[PDB]
Design a protein around this ligand. Structure first.
Ligand SMILES: C/C=C(/N=C/c1c(COP(=O)(O)O)cnc(C)c1O)C(=O)O
Ligand SMILES: C/C=C(/N=C/c1c(COP(=O)(O)O)cnc(C)c1O)C(=O)O
Ligand SMILES: C/C=C(/N=C/c1c(COP(=O)(O)O)cnc(C)c1O)C(=O)O
Ligand SMILES: C/C=C(/N=C/c1c(COP(=O)(O)O)cnc(C)c1O)C(=O)O
Ligand SMILES: [Mg+2]
Ligand SMILES: [Mg+2]
Ligand SMILES: [Mg+2]
Ligand SMILES: [Mg+2]
Ligand SMILES: [Mg+2]
Ligand SMILES: [Mg+2]
Ligand SMILES: [Mg+2]
Ligand SMILES: [Mg+2]
Ligand SMILES: [Mg+2]
Ligand SMILES: [Mg+2]
Ligand SMILES: [Mg+2]
Ligand SMILES: [Mg+2]
Lengths: 379, 379, 379, 379
C-alpha cells in the first residue's frame, strides 16, 4: 500500500540493473541488438515500438492512475488522436463536452467528422442530457472535469454507469486535475487521457501526452496504434515528463493553496463579475468536486464586468503571471481563451465568453501573485 | 546557387539574433509569452503548433529537397499517418508498392482500410501496371525507390505523369536514398516522406519523420494536421536530426563507397545466390537508378543458397555488423526482413523471401566490414 | 520585494526576447557569431567564457543567495577548486571544519597541501578555537553548517566577524541547508559554495557546483579562473539544475516535514544510540540553528547501539531508502559515511564514527519512509 | 587490427547488456545503488568519480590515440588544468611553445606562475632550442603541432627523446590534428591533450576536453585529480562528443580536401602576403608534417598585404565563413587571432601578427567557400 508520492518517484523506476544508476537512463537510441534473429534483449527491438525510458514513464503513469497499462505520446493531442483512431471507425458517434479544450473540439469536428465520426456536445454536468444523447452508434463519452476553461464538474462514477449501460467507453481527460487530485479509473472510467505538457511535466518545458487504461486488451489495441501510427513521446521528453512527475504532489499542494488565496482576492473585487473555481461552495458541481477530487486545482477563471475590453487589458497588464497559452507549470500563466486557446471554438456550442480570463496559478510566493493580479485589475 | 553540403549546415540555421549562437538553441519550452493577446513574438505561440528548433529542421529539409515547406514528426510512421489523414478520406483508394517497409503496409492495410480507404499493391517498376491500377477514387500513388528491402527502382518522373494525369498525388518515400542522392520534387513528386530515423539523423539515436512539399497549400493542409493531431518531433529530437543532417553528404559518400566494396565481396561468393544493389548493371531498373540517383546507396540485400536456415545463421554470426532493425546509421546493421522488419508483410503481396538478408553498410573501415561478412558467410 | 519562490522561477529567466519562449533555451553551442571583430552580440563570444543558459542559472543563484554574482561549475568539487585556486597561493593557510564532506578534506589535504597551502581542522561550533586557529597566513575560514555528516552547527555571523577581524574571507558551503533555509551572505559570509548536485538540482540527475559572492571584484577574480581553468557547468546540466531550483521551496518544505517525522521514529528506538538533527532541542547548536535557519533540513544521522555491524545491516536492509552516495534528491538515500562518502577522512581529525548511518530523507509518502526504517532497524 | 573508423564507432560502445540499445545511454544520474555497503554495481558509485556515458567516451578516445586510459573534462582548458595540477608543483618548470592557444598561455602565465611554476616559451620547431631550455626543475615539454594559429610543426618523436633524456614528460596538444591525422603516443608522447570542443565533437555544440595516456600509473594520478578537483565532462556533453567522434574520419577527409582548395585560392591572390598551411612544400616543417600527419588539416592562416586594417575587413565581409572564436566544426569559421583568441598573448613572446586571419575550413561545398573568400578579399 505505497503512497502516491512514493509511487511517483519509484514506480517503473527501479535502479538500473547493470550500473545501479538511481535515475532511469535516457535511451537515446533507435534500435537494439538481438541475440540471433528474434532474440530480444529485455524485450526491446525498436524505439517506436518500445523504448526503456518511455516504458518507465508509461509504468509510472499506470501506477499513479491505478491502471494496467500506460502509453506515452508526442503530445496530448496525439494521445487523443491515437485513442480515437483505435476505438472509433466511420459511422460511429462520440459525445463530447459542451466546454472543452479547443484542440479536442478541433480534432473531433475538423478531422474525425471528415473521417465519418458523428458527434454531439452535451452538458456533462447534466446526466439526463448525457443519457438522452446516447445513440445506437455511440462508442464513447468524452469527459473533461474540471472543464477547460469554465471548470465545470462531471460526476465520473455517474457517467461511467451511463456509458457502460450503452456498451460505450468512458474517456476522462484528467489533465487539469492530475492523478494526484482525481483518479477516474477508480470511479469506472475506461481510459484516462492526459496532456503531460501540463501538471505532470510541470515546468512548461515538454509537450507530451499519455493514455492509461484499466483493461489490458484495450491497452494492447492502443499499443498497436502507438506502434503503427508512431505518435510516440521521444525518450528525452519522456524523461523530463517523468522528472516532473516526481514533484507533482508538492507542486499541486502549493498550486491549490495559491489558487485558494487568488480566489479570495478575486471574489468581491469590484471589476470582477464572476469567479469560477470548483472549491467555491456555490460553484456549479461543488459537491461532486468534493466527493471525487482531493482538492480543487490550480486553475481559476473569472469574468470582467467591463467585457472583452477589460479582460484583454488585464491579460496585458500582469508582470508575474505570463500571458501565454498552456497551464500547469510552476510559473503562473494568464490567457484570454476566446482569442487564444479557444479561438478554435468560436461559433460552436463550445464558444467561451469574451469577458473571461483563465489563470494557471503557479507556485510563486502567493503575495506576489495576489499583488500582481490586483494591479492588473485596477482600471 | 549554394551547394547541398552548404545548405545542410546553413539553411534554416542563421546564427541566433540575440546572442550570435552559431548552433540553433534547443527550445525546450511548451509556450511563449505574447505582447498583449495575439501579440506573437517571432510568430510563436505553442510548441505543438510551431517550435523554433523544429522550424530550423523543417526549413533545412525543405531546402535540401527543394520544396516550399517541411514538417517534422514524431517518427517516419507519424509523418505517413499525418499525410494520409490529410489527403485521404473514407471511399478513397491508394496505390502502394509491392515491396515496401512493413510498417507502411501495416498502417495502410490494418488502420486506413478499417477507416474506409481501399488499396492495391502494384509493381511500381512497371508503369503499365501503375497506369491500369488507377481507379476513379485513387487519391495518391505511394512510391518507395529503392524499395525496402529488395531495392527495386521506380521511375519517379514517369509515375508523376501517370499520377497527375489521374488528378492524383505522387508521394515518394525518399528514406533510403536521402535528399543527397535523389530529389523527388525535382522529378514531379508532390510529397516527399522520410523516416529521419535513418540516414538524415544518421546515428541510430533519434526516431523521427518528415514531409516536404512543393505546393504551399498542401503544406498548410498538412500543417493543420501536424498541429491538430499533434504527432510532432520534439525539439531535442529535431535538434539531433538537424545535427545529423550536417554530415549527410560525407556519410553517404562513404556509405556508397563501402556498399560498392561489400557488393564486390558478395557477388560470386559460393554461399550467395543473388545480390540486390541498384549499382549492379543487371539489377532490375539499374538505368533508371543511374538517371535519378547521384549514387546507389548504402543498402545491400542478398539471398543465401542454403535458404532461411543459412540466412538466419549469417545474421547471428556477424561481429561488426549489428543484428537489429533499422538502417542508415554510421554503424553497420544486418537483419532478416522475413522475421524482423517485414514480419508484418507475411502472407501478403509484400511478403519477402525467407532466404534474404538485408545490410545497412555503415561507415566503418571497409576491410573490417568485408572480413566480418566473409567469416559470417563461411558455412 | 519579490519572494523566494518567485525569484527561483523568474530571476535570470525573463521570457526569450525573439520568440517569447517562457523557459530559457538550452544553448548547446560552443561559439557565437560577432558583428565585425569584437562586435559581440549580447556580450557572448565563447561558451567556456559565458553561455546564456549558464548565465540564467548564475543570475538565479545570485538572486536566491542575495549576492552580486553567481558562477556555475562542473561539480561542487570544481567550484571548491576554482575558489581555492583564486583566493590562495603557496604559503597561505586555511581553517577547515573538523567535520566536513570527505571530498573537501581530500582536495585541501591531498591537492592544495602539495601546492603549498597549510591547513588546520577546527571545531567551528567553538568560536574560541576558530579565533585562536587564525595565523598571520590565514586567507579563509571554510564553514559547513550543518556539517556533513554529523549536522553540527556554526554561527555564521560570529565566524564572519572573526574572519574579517583577521582580513580573511568567510566561505560557507551552504549545500545541506540550501538558500531556501539559510542565506550566509546576509550574515557576513564573503562566498557561498554549493554542490548543486544536492538540493538545488534536487533529482539526483545532474552533478554541478556554484559560487555566489557579495563583492563584485572577488566575483571578477573568480570569473577569470572559471574562464581560464574552464571547469564550467555545461548548458544542459545548468538547465536541469535551474529546472530543479524552481521546486526547491516545495521540495525542502516536504524534506523538513518528512525528516521531523523520521527523527520522531528514531528517537527512543531501542536499537538507536543517538539521533543527530539540528531541530532536536538538545542537539549541539540547536539555538544557533533556530536563529540562522528557516527550518532544520532533510538530513538525519544516527548511531546504532550494535556498532559498525548494526549500521552496515541497516544500510543493506532499506527497500525505499536507496543505499548510495549523495543527498538532496526527491528520492530517499541512506549511506554509511565511514566506508562511503567519508572513507577519505579515515585516520584524520575528520574520521566519522563507524556506527553512524546518514539519511537523506526524500519527499516520498512519510509513512512509507518510517515503515521502511522501522523494518530495517529490527535486528 | 580494427581500423580507425571502426574503432571510432565501436570502441567503448558495445550494445547495452540489458536492452541491446545500440547507442550508449545518457546516464543522467548523480549516483548509483550499491548492493550492501561497497557492493558496487558494474564498478559505479558517483558520477564525478565515474559515469558510464563518460567511460564510453574515455575508452573510445583511448582506443583512437592508442593509449591505456582516457579522461574526459568540462573543457579543453580543464583537461590542461587537471594535467598540470597533477604533474607539477611549486618550484617546477615547464617549456611551452612560442605559438600556442592564448588560453594555454594564460593558464600557465597567469595561474600556474602565481602558484610557483616557472616557464619558458621556446621554438619547438628548433630541437636545439628545446634541448637547451631544459632546466633541472623541468617536469614537462608542452607541444602543440600544428601550432595555433601559425600552424608551425614540431617533430614529436625528436622532442620525446629530448624530454625523456631529461626525465621530463612530453605533452602533445593534438587538438588541431585529431587522432585521425596524428597519434602522438605512437611517437613517444606521454600525454595527449584535446579540446574535444574542436574536431572530435565536430559540430560547434559541446565544450569539452580530454587527456589520453600511455602509462596506467600516470592515468591513475590524473584520475585522482579528475575525481578530487571534479572538472568532469557531464554525461550529455560526453554523449554528444562521442556522437561527433563517429564521423571524425569522413569529416576530416573533407576538411583536408576543402582546405587544400582554399590554399590554392589564397596562394598568389594579390591581397594575400603569405599563406600558412602544413601541406605547402615551402611551409616551415613541411617534411616533418609529411612523416607524422596522415594529411595536413582543416586550418589555414594567412597574412593580408594591407595590414591589420585589411585583415579586420576580410573577417567582417565573409557570408559563409562565420566570424567567431573556435574551430573544427562542420561549419566554416574565420577570426582575427590578434583581437580574438590570442588577445591574451598580446605583449608576450606568443603575440600573433596583427595582419593575420585564421580559417577553420568547414565541410560546406568547396566552391561556396572559395567564392566567399574571394569576395571578402576583394578591396
Ligand atoms: C495550448 C494547450 C492547452 N491545452 C491543451 C490540452 C490538451 C492538448 O494537449 P497538448 O497541447 O497536445 O499537449 C488536451 N486536453 C486538455 C484538457 C488540454 O487543455 C491550453 O489550454 O492552454
Ligand atoms: C524498423 C524501421 C525500419 N524502417 C522504417 C521505415 C519507415 C518508418 O520510419 P520510423 O521507423 O517510423 O521512423 C518509413 N519508410 C521506410 C522506407 C522505412 O524503412 C527498417 O526497415 O528497419
Ligand atoms: C558524493 C557526494 C556527497 N557530497 C558532496 C559535497 C560536495 C561536493 O559536491 P560534488 O559531489 O562535487 O557535486 C561539496 N560540499 C558538500 C557539503 C558535499 O556534501 C555526499 O556527501 O554524498
Ligand atoms: C576559443 C577556443 C579556441 N581554442 C581552444 C583550444 C584549447 C582550449 O579548449 P577549450 O576551449 O577549453 O575546450 C586547447 N588547446 C588548443 C590547441 C586550443 O585551440 C580557439 O582557438 O578558437
Ligand atoms: Mg532499468
Ligand atoms: Mg530495471
Ligand atoms: Mg460570433
Ligand atoms: Mg534563431
Ligand atoms: Mg534567426
Ligand atoms: Mg506462408
Ligand atoms: Mg534570454
Ligand atoms: Mg532575455
Ligand atoms: Mg583507524
Ligand atoms: Mg553499457
Ligand atoms: Mg556494455
Ligand atoms: Mg604592442
Amino acid at each position: 500500500y505505497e503512497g502516491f508520492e512514493t509511487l511517483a518517484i519509484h514506480a517503473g523506476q527501479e535502479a538500473d540493473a547493470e550500473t545501479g544508476a538511481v535515475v532511469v537512463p535516457i535511451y537515446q537510441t533507435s534500435t537494439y541488438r538481438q541475440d540471433g534473429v528474434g532474440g530480444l534483449r529485455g524485450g526491446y527491438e525498436y524505439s517506436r515500438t518500445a523504448n526503456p525510458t518511455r516504458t518507465a514513464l508509461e509504468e509510472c503513469l499506470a501506477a499513479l492512475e491505478g491502471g494496467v497499462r500506460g502509453l506515452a505520446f508526442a503530445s496530448g493531442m496525439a494521445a487523443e488522436d491515437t485513442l480515437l483512431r483505435t476505438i472509433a471507425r466511420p459511422g460511429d458517434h462520440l459525445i463530447i463536452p459542451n466546454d472543452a479544450y479547443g484542440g479536442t473540439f478541433r480534432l473531433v469536428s475538423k478531422v474525425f467528422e471528415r473521417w465519418g465520426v458523428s458527434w454531439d456536445a452535451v452538458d456533462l454536468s447534466n446526466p439526463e442530457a448525457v443519457r438522452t444523447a446516447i445513440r445506437p452508434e455511440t462508442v464513447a463519452i468524452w469527459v473533461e472535469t474540471p472543464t477547460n476553461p469554465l471548470l465545470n464538474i462531471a460526476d465520473i462514477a455517474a457517467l461511467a454507469d451511463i456509458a457502460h449501460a450503452a456498451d460505450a467507453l468512458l474517456v476522462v481527460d484528467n489533465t487539469f486535475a492530475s492523478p494526484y487530485l482525481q483518479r477516474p479509473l477508480s470511479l469506472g472510467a475506461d481510459v484516462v487521457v492526459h496532456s503531460t505538457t501540463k501538471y505532470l511535466g510541470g515546468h512548461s518545458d515538454v509537450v507530451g501526452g499519455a493514455l492509461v487504461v484499466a483493461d489490458a486488451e484495450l491497452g494492447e489495441r492502443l499499443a498497436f496504434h502507438q506502434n503503427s501510427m508512431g505518435a510516440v513521446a521521444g525518450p528525452f521528453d519522456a524523461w523530463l515528463t517523468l522528472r516532473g512527475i516526481k514533484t507533482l504532489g508538492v507542486r499541486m499542494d502549493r498550486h491549490c493553496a495559491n489558487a485558494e488565496r487568488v480566489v479570495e482576492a478575486l471574489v468581491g473585487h469590484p471589476e470582477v463579475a464572476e469567479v469560477l473555481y470548483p472549491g467555491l461552495p456555490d460553484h456549479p458541481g461543488h459537491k461532486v468536486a468534493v466527493d471525487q477530487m482531493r482538492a480543487f486545482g490550480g486553475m481559476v477563471s473569472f469574468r470582467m464586468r467591463g467585457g472583452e475590453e477589460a479582460a484583454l487589458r488585464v491579460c496585458a497588464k500582469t508582470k508575474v503571471f505570463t500571458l501565454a497559452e498552456s497551464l500547469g507549470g510552476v510559473e503562473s500563466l494568464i490567457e484570454h481563451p476566446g482569442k487564444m486557446t479557444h479561438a478554435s471554438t468560436a461559433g460552436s456550442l463550445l464558444e467561451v465568453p469574451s469577458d473571461l480570463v483563465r489563470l494557471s496559478v503557479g507556485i510563486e510566493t502567493v503575495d506576489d501573485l495576489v499583488n500582481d493580479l490586483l494591479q492588473a485589475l485596477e482600471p
